[model samples]
Structures are given as C-alpha cells and as structure tokens.
Target: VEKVFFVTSPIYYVNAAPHIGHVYSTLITDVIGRYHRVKGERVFALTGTDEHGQKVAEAAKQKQVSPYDFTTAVAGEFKKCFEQMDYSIDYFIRTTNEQHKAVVKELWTKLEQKGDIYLGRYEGWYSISDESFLTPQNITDGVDKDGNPCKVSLESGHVVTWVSEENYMFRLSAFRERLLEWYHANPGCIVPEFRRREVIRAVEKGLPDLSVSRARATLHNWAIPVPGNPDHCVYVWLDALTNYLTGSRLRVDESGKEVSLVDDFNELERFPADVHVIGKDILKFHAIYWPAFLLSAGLPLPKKIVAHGWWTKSLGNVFDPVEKAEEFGYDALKYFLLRESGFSDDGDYSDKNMIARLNGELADTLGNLVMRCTSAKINVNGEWPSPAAYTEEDESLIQLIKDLPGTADHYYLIPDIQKAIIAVFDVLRAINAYVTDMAPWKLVKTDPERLRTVLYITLEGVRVTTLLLSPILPRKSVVIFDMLGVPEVHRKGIENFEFGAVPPGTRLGPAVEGEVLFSKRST
Candidate 1:
C-alpha cells in the first residue's frame, strides 16, 4: 500500500495571470512526487485550473468575452507555465471537465441523503474578490472595486457586501466531532506540527454549516447547477475542491463518461491519496472542511495535507521565479526554492540571495565538481572509472555515499521535503571538502594509480548526489547521468540501494570542452 502514492496540487484559480505563488505550490508536489517515483513507487500526481467563481466572471466581463473563453485563455498561461517549469503532474483536471461536474453532483447528493446536508438561509458578508463569506469579527470598513462603501474581509482585505439568500448547506456543524476525532485517530495527517495545532484549535470551536450553494439569481449562471435544482448553483469552493476526487486510477476518457473514476480498484482495493499539496492563502478551516466531505461521503481520507508558505520579495512584493528563468536555469531556481525556504513558514525572496545560491552552490560547487572529475588531465580515460587501493579517506567517502540514500529517506519519508533537500547538500559540501584534501589534480602527475582511485571516488559521489536530487532537479540530473554514462533505465530508481563501483574502463564522455551541469546566470 505504501508503494503506491497519489499526490495533488490545488487546482489553480483562473481569474488572473499565473504567478510565482501558483508555480511554487505546484513545484512542491512535482519535486516530491518525482522523489517518490525514484524510490520505485507508483506515482500519480494531479494539478489543474479552477474555472468557476464570481472573480473569474467579473474579470472576463470587462474584456467582453464569455467566462468560458476567458477561462481557456487564462488556463493556457498556467498550462504553458507548468510545462516550461517542468512540472511532473500526471493528471491535469479542469473544473470545467464534464467528468468533474458529474462527480461533484454525485458526492453532494450522497451527503444530502446521509442527512448531512439541507436548505438554509445564508446571511453574511460576501467578498466578491475572494468569493467567500466573512465573519463579522473578520470584516471591516472598506471600498469595493467599484468605489462603493462596503465591508472588507480581513482574511483577504477585499471589499464585501451583506448577502442573504436561500441556499443548500452542508452540515459542517454536525461533523465537527468526527473531524476532530479523525485528527486524533490519524496523528500526523497534516504536516508541520505547528500548523496542525492551529487547525485543531479552530476545529475545537466547532463550525457553522457551510453554505454549499448560491441562488442562481446571485451566481449569474457561472457555476455548476445543483442536481435537482436549476435555481441554485453549487458554491464555488465546494465545486473546486472536488477536483481532488476526479483524478482517479482509471483512464477516464471524457467528462461525462462515468459517475465514478475509481472502478479500476475492484472491490478489494481503493486508491487512498497519499498527499494534498496546498498553499497558505487557502489554509484555514477549509483544510478541515475538505476532508470532512470525503469522510461524510465514505471515501478514503488523504494521509497527509501540507499547507506550505508563500513567497514575497525583498520589497515585500510577490516573487515570480518563472519570470527570471530565461536568464537563470529552471534547475537552479528549483534548488533555491527547496533548499533556501522551508515548508512551515513564509520565505522572503532576495535576488541577491538567489544569485548567491546559483553561483556558490550550483555553478561553482556541484557544477565545477563534475567539470573537475570529467576534465581530461585528471580523468584521462574520459570514461567511467573503477577504484582501487582503498585508503582510509576513500573508504569513509564510500560509506557516506552509500548511506546517503538512507539519510535522504529519513528526511523525505518524514516527508520533511525541505529537510530532505538540505540533507543532500550537506553531503555535497562534504564531497567538495573530500576532493580538496585528496588533491586528485596533483595526483595526475605524481601518482597515476592514486589519481585513478581519487577520481573514481569523486564520480561515485556525484552519482549519489544526482540520485537523491532526481526529484528536485529532473532535467539537470538526467543531463549529469548522460555525461557519466549511467543507463537511462537504471536512473529510474534502485530497489535496495547499495554501493557498486563503476564498471572498469567504461566510457564516460569524450571530455567535452566547456561543458557545465548548471549554467551560470548574470548577477
């Protein structure tokens, strides 16, 4: 069961241009999902665009385009962004997918019959920008986009107005006990222990029944219609959250092909999701509400939910790394994000700090390390080499290389992805120090035999680094493997990792002049 992993990125909002925050959220899942696959797990990663909401409708109005047309335009930007950024998601879902619409209707109908859903009058301050209701405690005086007086949702600081209507309600109040019980029963269901506590505290207060639909008069024909009622549309958040369930183990052809997408699992098995990758903005009670929907519908709860932090710049503006990728390789940008920032809290972006990492760690350190071992003078064979005459230092380095997978296993499977990335770099610095002392450059003239031993050890260490980083730096790692002649098939993963010396006299490369693993960017 542990061998099969399912991970998902929150379906992106399509109201604006794709930004760095959206990329970062998807990147987190892409990197870790790749890691799981390298460890020989069957991996299914999901990401997509969320197309329904008043924000999207409003944004399209000024352009004089239909909301569907606007959704397609914005979705194109997000799709291209993911491809250019090298996302590894297997499923690309759209709230507009017919498959998506049916599953949502089915799930909501089940909840209704289970006595956990009903009709209610929704009265609250609604934020048009956020398309969410805000509590009186969280609302304050503000101006709307239209320049009218309105209350603002403190949660997002967006203008809001009092909205009252008859709507369908999910019995969130009735499920609070079971939601709390699920947390206690499934320890570590959410990542970052500190954030988990915050959710628990909020849950303990209990919750009001969530208004799950809006009057058709208010929704403006912009959302999915409730199963039996044409007068109401399913609430935006509830419609969006169902994207997680639509990505199942089946090869579902189109939107309306079937009601369930998981028939592939026969009666004896089911695809329990292994992870939920969410960002900090949507990281409040919804984190609790999403899982409750699954439990009430008798579905498998995801094993982990990681609400990661957002990125801001030196001036406190939102950071968009993809904007800078044309100058800096995506490889280096990915490394900076995983290594420099952690999962639990917000990370400030400094171009200076980012450049420093690219120049210091990637270019000068790892990149140069490979250049040195592959340089002709030290490695005359221009091919993979075998080691001999093991010295104490040589053996110590081998032990470290072999044990690194386990060290990485500890951090990644703790699923502390940030710590896992940091774990690998600790070894990179060690390898650099090892080469500094071994002085293999000098050994090339004085002692050819010792030079062979030193160079071989260095190459072996490079292989270890590449394997651990396969998830974070997919393109970069594949390039390094080709230069060293590691077979394309073997690079997929190792079942039980071990230290195997490279084949004696294997051809590495023809000593390519001016070759570099990570390209240096302008400061």
Candidate 2:
C-alpha cells in the first residue's frame, strides 16, 4: 500500500498571543512534513487555533467582547503569525468552525450510542486555567497572591477549586487495560519513552470516568452544546481533540478540487494521523484520552504522539516568535530552535546564543562557502563547471554528500529534528573544511582543470546541503537554489541528492551576484 503522511501541531489555544513554544511545535511539524515530502510521500500538515474553551471564555469576559469576536480576532493573529513565518501547512483548522463542531457532536453521539458515555455527578478539583480536572494525588499545598493557603495543580501551579455538578461522563476507566495493551504492543508509540512510562504509571494507578460536559449556563454559552441535551456543553478537551478528525476530511487534489471528509470517516486515507506534535504539558490528553476516544468510536489510533518541551529564559520571559523571526531571519530562528533545543527535554531561548549561532555557523561558515564558490574569481563564466576527474579528497567529499540524506533520514523519521539538523550541519562543516584545504581560488590559476573539479564539488556541496536544509530554511534555501541554478524539479526528494543533479554548464540565476544566504543578524 502507498503511504500517506499526515502530521499536525495541536491546534493552539486562542486565549493568548502566540509564543515561542507555539512556534516551536509548529516548526517541528512543518519540518517533519517537509521531510516526508522529500521522501515522495503524500503529506498533509495541519495547524490552527483551538478556541471554544473555558480559558477563552474567561479571557473574552475580561476583554469585554463576545467570545466569537475575541476568538475570531486571536485566531486571525495566529493565522498571520504562521503565514508570515512561511509554514508550509496544507490546512489551518479552527475549532470554532461549524464543520468541527459538527464532527465533535457526531463523535459525542457515537460514544453515547455505544454506551461509552453516561450522565453522572462530577465532583473533583478543577483548574480553570489548565482547563483540566485533577485527582487529589495531583494537587499540592500552595499559596495565592495574598499568600493564602490553597491547593494547586502540581504540574502547572494553577489554583484548583472544588466543583460538583451533573455532567456527561465518558467511560474512560473501561479502556485502561486496552490502552495498556496498546502501549505494551507498540513500545515506541510515544517519543522520549520516559513520557510513555509516566502515562503508564498514572493509568496503572487507575483510570477515572472523565466528565465530558459542563453546565451550559455556567460556561456563559461559549461552547458547543450537547448534541441532544442543550442544557450542557461538551467538555473543552473533547471539543478540541475533534479538530484533528475534522481536518482529516479535507484534501487538495491535482486539479485544485477540495475533497471533504465529512461523511466518509471510514474511508479517510488521512484518518490516522502519522504524528501529533504537542507540548509535554498535554501528553496525558493526546497519549491517553485521545486514543481512548478513538477506540470508543472504532477509529484507528494515531501512529505516534511526539511531546516536546518548553522554552524558558534566565530572567523569566518567552520570545514573541513572530517578532523574533522578523528581527532575526526566519530560517535562522528555525535553525536555532531545532539545533539548540532538546527534542524531548527542555531548552532555553537566549538572544546571545541565537546571535552566536547565526554568525559563527550560518553567516561566517555557510555564507562564506556559498559566496566563495559562486564569485567571478572562481567560476569566471558563472556557470556550473563540470568536474575533470575525481581526486581522493573530491571523492571523499562526494561520499559524505551522497550519504547525507540517508544519515539524516534515520533521525528525521524518528522525528529527532535536532539530530537530523546536526547531521546536515556536520556535512556542511566538512564541505567548508574541504574548500579551505583545496584552495579552489589558487587552483584557478595553477591547475584550471582541478579548479573545475574543486568548484563543481563545492557548488554540489552547497546544492545538496541546501536541499537537506530546505525543510528548516524554506525561504532562504529557495534563494540559494536559484543562485546555483538548481531547477525546481530537482530541489526536492532524496533521489536528487547526487553528483550531477545540477548538470554542467547550467547558467547561474542572476540572483547569484553577491547574494548572502545567511547574513550576519543584527543584535
């Protein structure tokens, strides 16, 4: 069977402005999607805003506007952020979309018909900020702004309040053993195995029936009302998770026709998402609740749940990703995030670190290589020079370039983006070193034939590296490819990573004149 790769960034909560963590998650998803694209697999990458939650409702109230107006405006901001940052997302789904609401209600009806849902009294400690209920074991003693005694969620330090009300509940406890069996069968279903074990420990402790609804009146009528029972609204998490399914129903064809997955749930090629990229804070929802929901609906489970870590700063602040991207180049920011941040562990975001990486590696090293090889001093005609013969050093460099896509393939598929990026960067460093030792500029006068081979190898190195790095450096890479006169047809896929893809005597695009791919970023 032909494989279809579907990846998603958890639809972001629309209660606040976009942050560095949000961009990080989406960037990871975009990179993975691009990787699969280069592998010649059909890819659908979805990202959007997750509105219709208690947090959004409260934020709307504080801002003095209708919930719809507030979410609409914020969702637009998120859309602008991604579009401006140039994410190659196939679709942007909003939870407030009518189609999504319809899907959520449909799932609610299915679970209710399956006897997986029941009316029950919900009595527990709930955190409005986190929009999740917690057991006594998950709360800790804490104090509020006034230093008054209170109970807080152990994970996020948000205050919890006792809530008791009649609501719709899902039979989550019934799937505990099934979920365990699934995890046992697919040990690598979740990235960073430690997170999986943590989930297992919690489930092994016991699964509790989850309240899947809230009193509609208490919610200020800001949520999806129950399908039949209009008195209650579906829980925020339940409403939010259905966005992935709603997004699955959409696909663009070669003729630009948009196909809808509305009535054909069982026939969706993208039904089971290949990966769900999210923050570690929401692992329980995706790893456990989401699968259980799918099982209840008789839908296939997603292939993997990749939970990434948060970005913190030393003095206490996070970057507004869009602003940072505008200040530093988008590709530079994208490269820094993937290269510096740990895939499964927390990482810091500092201006000092970013500038150093941009200058030392991107500007000084990579930019220097591109400029030197493309300069009139080397390739006097400004055309790709065919090599005369393979010297030992030339063959060695070609071997590394040939092996690069495969080497990065291992990590990219693991979705270990940090390591995948490092693999390509390692090759770039070698290419730079080879250029320094060969002194192609000096060879131009002494041995013109060897100079042809040297420059060919150097340009090929840039071409191969640009393709490998295209996933992260989308905009800048296109410029580099144009400068090298690499045809668009050969700019993608691993098969194009070869010695003669560009061919000899290809006229370099006019953009090659003194073009700086990665310029020195201003502090």
Candidate 3:
C-alpha cells in the first residue's frame, strides 16, 4: 500500500510579506516532509497564498492598484521566497485560482444542502487588517506606549461596530457541543499542549456566534461568491479553510466533472493529515472553528493541529516596545525552530540569542567535530581508511550508531523534533569523546592499526549521524555525507540499518576546507 501524507504551513495572507515566522513554519513542514520521503513514504506538501479578504483589499489600496493585481504581485513574492528557501512543496494552492473557486463553491453547496448554511445578517466589530472581527472582550482599555486611549488602530477606535447586513452563516453553533465532546474524547488533537487546554477551556466557557459568510459590500467582490447566494461572498475563514480540501483533490474540480477529486473520498476513509503547522495567533481557527466545520460536514477531523510559537525580535525588549517585531534572520531563526523549541511550544527569537546558538552549537560543536575528524583522517592517513576490526571503544560507538535510527524514529513519531535534534548532537558528543579517548593521531606511528580502527569507527558514526539529522539540517547533512563519500545513504527504515554503506576504498570528495556549518550573525 502506498502511504500518503499531507502537510501544510498556514496559508499565508497576501496583505503582508513573508517573515521569519512564516519561513520557520514552512521550513518545519518542509523538513518533516523531507524526512518522510527519506523513509520511503509518498508525501505531499501544500503551501500557498490566502488572497481574499478585507486585508487584501486594503493592501491593494495602499499600493494604488486593484485588489486582484496587488494580491497577484504579492503572491509572487511569497512564491519567490519559498523557492529561495528550497521549500519542497507539491502544490501551491491559491484561493483566487479557478480550481479553488470551484472546490469552495461545491463545499458551500454541500453544506447548504445539508441545512448547515443559512442566509442571515452579520453584525460585529471587524479588523480590516486582521481580516477578523473583534469581540468587545478582545479590545483592551489600557493606554498605548504613546499614552493614547487603547484602540484597535490609530484610525479605528476601540468601540466594536454594530452594523448588521445580509450574509450567509454556517450553522457553527450547532456543532459547538459536538466539538466540545470530540475535544473531551481526544485530549491532544490540538497541539503545543497548552493550546489544547486553552481551546477546551474556551469550549467549556461557550462558543461565540460566528459569521461564516459575508456580503460583497461589507468586504469586496474579490472573494469566492456564495454557491446559492450570488450577492454574498464566502467569509475569509471558510474560503481559506477549503484550500486544505481543495489541494488534496477532495473537493470538486473547476470543470464540474465530479464531486470528488479522487475516488478515495467515498471510500469512507479519512485522509490522515499528520500535522497542520500553524502560528499561535491563529490557533483558534484551526483548533476550534475548523474541526466544528468538519464535524458538521460529517468528515473526519485532521489528526492534529500543531501550533508553533512566534519569532519575536530581540530589539523590542531594548527600545520602541510598541513596534512590530523585526524581520528574522533566516539561518538563526531556522536553528531555533529545528533545535531549541519543542514541536508544540513557543520559542522566542532574538538577534543575541540566535548568534549565541549558532556560534556555540553549530560552529563550535557540530561543525568543529566534522572538520576535526575529516581533517585528521585526510592529513594523517593521506586518504580514507578501510573499515578496520572493532576495538572496545569502536564497539561502543558502533552500538550507539546502530541504535540512533530507532532513537530518531521515536522522536519523529512523537513529533518531538527538538528531542530528535538533541539525539543527533548526543551522538556527535559521543563521537568526540570516543575520538579523544582513542587518540587516533597519537596512535598513527606506534599502533597504526589502532589509528585506522579509530578513524574508521569515527567515520561510521558520522555517517549514521548525518543520515539521522538529514531532516533538520539538509544542507549541512549533505555536506557531511559527501565529505564522508557516502552520498546516497539509503534511509529506508529502522530495519534497513546497515553499516559500511560508504564502501571502503571509495575516493572521498574534497572536504569543505574551511566552511562552517553554523555561524553566528546578528538580526
């Protein structure tokens, strides 16, 4: 059976350019996707632009162009950045695409036919920039850093708007009790552990009235039109959430050919979406509203909603506390997402903190270990050594190397990427310790066989470590793999663990003479 895995970063809002937070989430999904591929699983990674909303319209106004033109241009920028970051995405679904429109309309029609959608009037406080309405409770009464009355924005005051207009509403409240029951039954369905608790607490408190569809006049005419109601557009959340189904080919195609994209939809099998990696700020949409929509539609819920923490700039603590967080420096932010933060926990990003980690962890430890071992083998032996008979230290190191795939697999299955990262480094630390005790350099003249044995064992450890760490640090892992002359170390599964994948007597490639895998840089 072909194993299928679907993963996505949050569909980016076109109103804003990509930031460190956006890249971090994309990178995490990309890494996980890559790992699955290495394990020989068929994987599909989806990411793209969320092009419709009041935010898109306002951004268009700022740029002095039509909303379509502005969003198209900005969406290009998003695509460019993902390409630059080497994101291995399969389909980049855009809400404005004809395919998406058809899928969304079909979904709307299905829900409407089932009496889950109704034409009604919506009245609430809206944040045009946020593309969301604010509850009166969302507004704070404190003064700004400039001592102005707390407001939604400088132009928009704190008072919630009370404008009611004709629109379409999903029967969101009907599913609220059922959603709560589902949450009670599935404790960790939503992630970051804390976010699940927050959601359950909110559900226990009671769900607020949600307006799922909007009229053209309230926002603009750029959104997907409601299936039955031509005057209104589907609300941003409903339209955007449909992209998940749309990308999976679960929704209808634009040709009106069939209701299902693939024949599998009617098979009564749920597509196990392993993870929906999203930002903390948008947790409620994924964790609460989304599941409710699925339950009401009689579809299976996604396996888990993994909400990640924000990447805030260090400068905010120093001065200008009110300013938005600064842009994240890529490599620094990448390290934090992969190394420091637990999969479901928030991680703070700062220029100072990033630099320290790069210098100390990547440059000082992992990089140094790679350089030291490869350089020693090349300089002393003049070439790569054959796999020699194992010594006591060699046997101990081999045991650890043999066990690493299982350890890494445990971390991957539990979705504890941080722990997996640490496991890789633990092997590195052990190799360093083994090298120190073996003292291969000192043994070269007196006990040349011992020297060969030590070098051979160290190279094997490096091979195993590189394969295990391939997901988190692909570039660095590739560099190490090439240097060790094992470019195609097949990563099938725990059962495929075989030593000496890098054949003896194979000519090693030119090692990265002075390249540092990780470097400290200020944000």
Candidate number with greatest TM-score: 2
Relative to the true structure, how large is the alpha-carbon lDDT of every model?
0.78, 0.85, 0.70
lDDT tens digits, residue span 1-523, model 3: 3446778778888887776667777887887787787777777777888999777886788788999888888888888777777667776778888877887787777787788877676776666555566666675454544776644622234333445777677777777788888887877677767778888887787776678777787676878888766778888888898788776764424532225455344332325467787877777778887887777667778877877766311455442111212343344355555786775445555557756777777776677777766775433644457766776767888988888888888777656678888998898888888878877667777787667677777777777777777777666677776766664634445434456666556555675556655554554
Worst 10 residues of 1 by lDDT: 262-271
| Candidate with the greatest lDDT versus the true structure | 2
Pairs that collide, model 3: 192-344
RMSD of 1: 3.0
Tens digits of per-residue lDDT, candidate 2, 1-523, equal: 5656889998888878877778788889999998889777888888888888678898999999999999999988888888887888888888887778889988999999999999998998998887889989889999986899999999889889999999999999999999999999988789877888998998898899999999987788889999889999999999988888988886556643345655875455787888999888888999999999999999899988988876311567646777888888889999988988765455656898899999988888778887888788888889898889898988899999999878888888777888887888898999999988998889888999888898988999899888888888888888888877888899886569665788898888774344477778666
- In each prediction, how many residue pairs overlap at the backbone (N, C-alpha, C within less than 3 A)? 3, 1, 1
Candidate 3 Cα RMSD (Å): 5.1
Per-residue error for 247 in candidate 2, Å, reads 0.6
Q: Report the lDDT tens digits of candidate 1 across residue range 412-465.
A: 865677788777777778889999998888887898888778888788788778
Per-residue error (Å), model 3, residue 13? 1.1
Two-way lDDT contest, 1 vs 2, winner? 2
Candidates ranked by TM-score: 2, 1, 3
What lDDT is reached at residue 449 by model 1?
Answer: 81
Global CA lDDT computed for model 3: 0.70
Candidate order, lDDT descending: 2, 1, 3
| Model 2 ranges off by over 4 Å | 145-147, 251-261, 266-268, 311-318, 344-346, 511-514, 521-523
